[PDB]
Each structure stands twice: as structure tokens, then as C-alpha cells.
Amino acid sequence: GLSDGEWQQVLNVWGKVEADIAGHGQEVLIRLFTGHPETLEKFDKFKHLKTEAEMKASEDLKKHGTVVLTALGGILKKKGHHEAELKPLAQSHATKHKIPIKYLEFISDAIIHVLHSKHPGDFGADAQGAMTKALELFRNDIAAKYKELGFQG
Numbered sequence: 001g002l003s004d005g006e007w008q009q010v011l012n013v014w015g016k017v018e019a020d021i022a023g024h025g026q027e028v029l030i031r032l033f034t035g036h037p038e039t040l041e042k043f044d045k046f047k048h049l050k051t052e053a054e055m056k057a058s059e060d061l062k063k064h065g066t067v068v069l070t071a072l073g074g075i076l077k078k079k080g081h082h083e084a085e086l087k088p089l090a091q092s093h094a095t096k097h098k099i100p101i102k103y104l105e106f107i108s109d110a111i112i113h114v115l116h117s118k119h120p121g122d123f124g125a126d127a128q129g130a131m132t133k134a135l136e137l138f139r140n141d142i143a144a145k146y147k148e149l150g151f152q153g
């Protein structure tokens, strides 16, 4: 798991996100969609977004970024005690949305990138280590639920 110190770093970084949840959310999704266009195909409601300018201009994309990062934030504040929060997420992304675990790796990487981009020189080596551990824990617990369901893609 994560140490007390590590959780404190995680929630300190998260305070930076919370100052502009929609901006961070928008940028996370744009990084994901532009880096991995196959992911855009999982969103019938974002399929019409044919350019990055269109992505930037979409208020609905910002709304969804808000929903996604609010859910992750709730999970992170549980400091690993997140079975109740995580289980329904795991189940909807496997059975309804059909999201391979690879795509959760992609969005985890996108969060790290966006943190550096929005906070250059203010996201230290210790903070990146801690946040990376937290995202891996999140991914690994979802992967366990995916294995239960026999889900691959």
C-alpha cells in the first residue's frame, strides 16, 4: 500500500486539481483522446469531436472531465479503503462501457502529464512517486474486479 506520508503527498497534489477541476478534467481527456484516438470511440457523445479545437470548445467535454475527476478524488480521499466506491466503477466500465484496463493505464499516464503541464516545477519527484502509487493501486483494484468478471475488452 501507501505510507501515511505518501497519502499526504497524494492529497496535497489533489488540492491543486481541486482549484480548477473542470480545467484539469478537460486537459486529461484531451490528452487521452489525442494520444489514443481509439479511446474517443468508446464515447458516442464525443465521436463528433474531430479536432483538438473542437475538443477545447466542448462544454460537455469539460462537464464529463468534472464528473471523472470528482469520482477519482472521492476514491483517493479514502486512502485505499475504497471497495464501495471502486466496485461499481469497475463494473460499469467493464460491463457497460467496455473499457479495457489498458485505457485506464492511458488515463493514469495522462493525469501525470497534465499535472506536470499545469504545474511545471511544482510537482516534485516525491509527489510524482506518491501519485503514481495511488493511480496504480486504483488500476490494480479495478483489474481484480475485471478478472472476476472475465473482462478483457
Ligand code: HEM
Pocket: 039, 040, 042, 043, 044, 045, 067, 068, 069, 071, 072, 088, 089, 092, 093, 097, 099, 103, 104, 107
Ligand atoms: C480515472 C479513471 C476514470 C474514472 C474515475 C471514470 C469515472 C466515470 C464516471 C463517474 C462515469 C459516470 C458513471 C458511470 O457510468 O459509471 C463514467 C462514465 C463513462 N466512462 Fe469513465 N472513468 C474513468 C476512465 C475512463 C476511461 C479511460 C474511459 C474510456 C477510454 C472511460 C469511459 C467512459 C464512458 C464511455 C462513460 C459513459 C459516458 C457517457 O455519459 O456517455 N472512462 N466514468
